[PDB]
Amino acid sequence: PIVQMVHQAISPRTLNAWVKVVEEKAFSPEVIPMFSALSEGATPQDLNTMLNTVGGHQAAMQMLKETINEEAAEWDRLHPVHAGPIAPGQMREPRGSDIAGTTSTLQEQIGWMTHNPPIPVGEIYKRWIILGLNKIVRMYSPTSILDIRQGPKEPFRDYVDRFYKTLRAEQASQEVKNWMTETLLVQNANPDCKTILKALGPGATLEEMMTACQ
Amino acid sequence: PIVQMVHQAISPRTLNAWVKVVEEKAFSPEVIPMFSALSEGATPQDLNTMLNTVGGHQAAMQMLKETINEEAAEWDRLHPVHAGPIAPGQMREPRGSDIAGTTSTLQEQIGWMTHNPPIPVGEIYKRWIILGLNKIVRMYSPTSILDIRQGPKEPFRDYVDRFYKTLRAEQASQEVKNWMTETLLVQNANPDCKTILKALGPGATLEEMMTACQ
Amino acid sequence: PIVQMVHQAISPRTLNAWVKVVEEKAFSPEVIPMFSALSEGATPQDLNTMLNTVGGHQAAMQMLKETINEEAAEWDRLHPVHAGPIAPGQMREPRGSDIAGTTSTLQEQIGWMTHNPPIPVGEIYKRWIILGLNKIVRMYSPTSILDIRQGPKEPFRDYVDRFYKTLRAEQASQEVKNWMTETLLVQNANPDCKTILKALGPGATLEEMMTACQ
Amino acid sequence: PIVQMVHQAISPRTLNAWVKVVEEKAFSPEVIPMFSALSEGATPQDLNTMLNTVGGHQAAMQMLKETINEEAAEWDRLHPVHAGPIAPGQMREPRGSDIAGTTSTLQEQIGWMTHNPPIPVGEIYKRWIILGLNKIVRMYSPTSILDIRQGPKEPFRDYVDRFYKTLRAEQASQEVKNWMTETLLVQNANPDCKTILKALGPGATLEEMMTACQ
Amino acid sequence: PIVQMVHQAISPRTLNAWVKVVEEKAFSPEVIPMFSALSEGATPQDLNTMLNTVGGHQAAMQMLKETINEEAAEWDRLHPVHAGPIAPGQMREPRGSDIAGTTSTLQEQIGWMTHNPPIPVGEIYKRWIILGLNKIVRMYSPTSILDIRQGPKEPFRDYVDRFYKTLRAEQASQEVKNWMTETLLVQNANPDCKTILKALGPGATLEEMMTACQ
Amino acid sequence: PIVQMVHQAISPRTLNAWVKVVEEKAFSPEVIPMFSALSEGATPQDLNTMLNTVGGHQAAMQMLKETINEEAAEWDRLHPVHAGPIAPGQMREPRGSDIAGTTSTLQEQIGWMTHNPPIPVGEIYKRWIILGLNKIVRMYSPTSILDIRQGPKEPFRDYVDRFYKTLRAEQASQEVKNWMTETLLVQNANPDCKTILKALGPGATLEEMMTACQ
Amino acid sequence: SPSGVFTFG
Amino acid sequence: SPSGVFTFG
Amino acid sequence: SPSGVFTFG
Amino acid sequence: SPSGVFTFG
Amino acid sequence: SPSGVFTFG
Amino acid sequence: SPSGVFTFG
Ligand SMILES: [Cl-]
Ligand SMILES: [Cl-]
Ligand SMILES: [Cl-]
Ligand SMILES: [Cl-]
Ligand SMILES: [Cl-]
Ligand SMILES: [Cl-]
Ligand SMILES: [Cl-]
Ligand SMILES: [Cl-]
Ligand SMILES: [Cl-]
Ligand SMILES: [Cl-]
Ligand SMILES: [Cl-]
Ligand SMILES: [Cl-]
């Protein structure tokens, strides 16, 4: 990565940390923040390093490759190239392949990221990767929010835990999530807690609901 | 974080440390100082990083989200925005969403924290988070201070350990805690130790009590 | 801490190290040097961080709180406050609560420790804490030096190990420790080794005694 | 390695990391990126250090030695040496043996890498090594892409995982890989999923295929 | 410690390393180099830190205390103190207690070690400690070099291993060690190897002896 | 060590790494590169530190001591000393004992290594040590290259692994190793693979041989 | 398209 | 509102 | 010759 | 009051 | 004398 | 007095 600006190699325990995360948590939602946390200020070379070091899960890595290709082609479409020799006091504009680091050298990425004004190629590639990881996490969710129903002997806290776990997995827009929380959460509770939640009212906070069905 | 001022990424073993703390201790009181200790000088991006990397416990994380939203709306209420173009030698004032890092870039947070005079957005967001964690820890306490009573075969030291454990969990004000220590601690001891503590007097220190019922 | 002067956050493995020490060794004597070793140059905020992250043992932590309060009130008694506006080229004198870090900001502690001449608030608070830890370690010792007697089949080396273990636990003054070494050590040995130690003389070193009863 | 330019020794946990990777993953594809990730900015001395510390697998290490020798002889062929005393303000051009570090000192490699303009001997030797590792990984693959066929009870995701695992192992050119994906993947699926994939069309993405046979 | 000159605190894993060494190896010879290796450039405060953090073995730690006291009194005898106010451009000369760090502040030790010309108090105290550790290691050796005899079925290499293990434990002068190697090693071998070693000659190297009795 | 030039102490995990290597791998060939990798830029004091911290194997450590003594005496023979007072702007030339660090201070080694022009005492002592380790590794090899023969049911890859393992152990000159590879490898293969290797030809690469007997 | 899993980020 | 769990902080 | 295993690199 | 456990410190 | 175990070094 | 355990140091 490049930290405040000096450039360092990706540390061993960052690599081992990312490999261990992929091995342990597979494609749980929290894998995506951890990824983002293990790659702050990272160049495209570091991002490709993290992705290439993943063993197995080659179907998801192939889907991620396809997503990266789509985002690259879209970038090249929105940024047409202009012919002409590069001036001695300037540097070329990156293509879609240069953002991914496939056709760009390390010092070209450094020169892009440290220039005034800056061209944040690492963060662009990073948000492309995070898009692909979003598609993977959403696809690999085994459950649907419609099937999360509270058991007759189940405490309210565990039911809410399952509900917001699946909800985080589905990655719907905040309005749709608002509707699922406002309707399904109270709707799919067990009879007693459901009655109490109905008595609480439409605009109750989650804290009031949990302490009410406690 | 930003240490003396240079900016660094959140280290891998800080992440792994926080994840291990959440996995092991769940929402024990000491989780909150550890959190504060793992996030000194942290930007909002680092705080959101720590929160997002929590797997499971999504009910508590949702309550924490609600608390953060409330504190943000209150901040925006106490700080009304003024229209006008930002001067070349100044920078905009953050909203409630900028403190949480949802609508603020990393370099905007850095520019807020390193400016003269400083705007400590990381510590504001941090104290909001700590508020929410306080509500979570208080709610998840299984015991009440009224139910901590010394057994007939129980040594005094273990009884005091349980008592101040629950007391730390309840998070009442220092005056109420003073009353609970002054009344309940001696009140709920076993007959013999209770008599000895009565004979000690009203203004005895905890050391004198423990060495008296030793 | 503040090292040569730059200020850094308390490292993760320092925290984990202190937590592991408290979990493993409980309140053995060596816990106090380790504590001192894990908190060199530490600000009051770092010391309170280490203390707050202790789970369980809340009786000892409460006793430590009482000791810290006593030392703070004594400090405030010996240092009366003087009213008046703080000059632009000076800074206020800390109270007892500021030494403990309860009512002092981080940059106030840094400004106290780095000023010329220096006000070592971290070391004052540190020696208060070490006082409280001394009271805790002394109270939690299960043995007394009077009960350490050499067995008939016991080698001399193990007997000396037990003896100086309890001796280190009791924390008596060096003169009283000198008397316990000069009288009890030879007094409480088994008949044969006791006779040999009597034949050695009053001013023999521990090395000569161990190699004599070897 | 040499990072931004200062020169440091190869760290212990980088060594231990590489040894553990060779012990665990043997010659899986992901071993090559990990290698590249554990040797960024590394001098030839560091690369030879990583290779020499490998215990066992001496057949593969011998093949790697042969590949390195071939690439060195080719380099010396494309770069003929010119006789003449080295000027006081210049430095000699490296031979094939100097790139591998066998006949070049450490400060000669540093002087080659830090000079203006730079001679990247570490990256040349590194790409030679990566060539040899490519030959080793390709040779040690136990499977062929023609034998990866979906079972009657096998989910589509696992079949794709096996398929792209072997595909990554074979290291064929991107056009040949494109043909294998376009023909064999749909061709070798079980009857039902095969029919569905035929109905999808020739230009479907992997995501659409996996969500179709889900 | 103080490294090239900046002063740092003793690191956590240095402490944990020393504690683990004392727990594992007890008082084997190699404990002394490890100690010396874990305390390079260390101030007296760091040395006392390492010694104080040792749990158990209080007999050996007491002997070490006695040795340190003797060396301190000898130092004070060879360096008599001279009365007079300390000049503004000078600093006082340390006593025996200041070398051990018992009556000297941290910045006094730093001022002693960084002054021109330097007063190496850390290395003086360090060699005193190493003296005491030498007495402890020599005393705690269970074997004598006279009792190391080669078995009839024992290979020569293991016999030499035992022999030089005990030899390293005894810590005799190099001339006495030379005599023990020249006489006892060949003397105490089993009949066959003894005859072969006699046939080799008086001035054979250990390599020739081991490859002869191989 | 001394890295680019600043001097640091030998790190704890470098020590622990070297001790673990000696415990695990004993005197396998790869122990020597690891040693060299754990001691880059190391002063003689660091090298002696690594050697002294080895527990057990005292026969090999004694042989290593003898080799170091021989190389030292040879160095002193090739570099006769000249009497005369050391000039204020110069420094003395090291003897054989100064290279090993037995009679040279730390700052004398630093002054030797950082001087212009440099005197690389650490690398001289290092290559002496590596010589002794070469003699030890060669002596401790249990096998001979003449006894490595392919079994009737044994795959070719394992046979080559054994062969080049023993070959690396013997440490013969590159010409003798070339003859052993050219003659013994094909000579000692099982009948079928032997016939195929004969049919391949005299100048086949190892890759062609392994893929031929695959 | 998916909105992401960053609840607080 | 809760007062926190920082006993010494 | 082999093309490598760097899928994204 | 206790004298501490620092035997050498 | 032995040639060493550095195959690539 | 003992000579130490530093064989090479
Ligand atoms: Cl509940
Ligand atoms: Cl569920
Ligand atoms: Cl008690
Ligand atoms: Cl309880
Ligand atoms: Cl004994
Ligand atoms: Cl006892
Ligand atoms: Cl599937
Ligand atoms: Cl397969
Ligand atoms: Cl032998
Ligand atoms: Cl023995
Ligand atoms: Cl084979
Ligand atoms: Cl073999």
Numbering used by the authors:
A (entry chain A), B (entry chain A), C (entry chain A), D (entry chain A), E (entry chain A), F (entry chain A): 1 to 4, 10 to 219
G (entry chain B), H (entry chain B), I (entry chain B), J (entry chain B), K (entry chain B), L (entry chain B): 1410 to 1418
Paper lines:
During maturation of human immunodeficiency virus type 1 (HIV-1), capsid proteins (CA) assemble into a conical core (or capsid) surrounding the viral genome. Formation of a core with optimal stability is a strict requirement for efficient HIV-1 infection. CA folds into two distinct domains connected by a linker: the N-terminal domain (CANTD), composed of seven α-helices and a single β-hairpin, and the C-terminal domain (CACTD), composed of a 310-helix and four α-helices. The cores comprise ~250 CA hexamers and 12 CA pentamers.
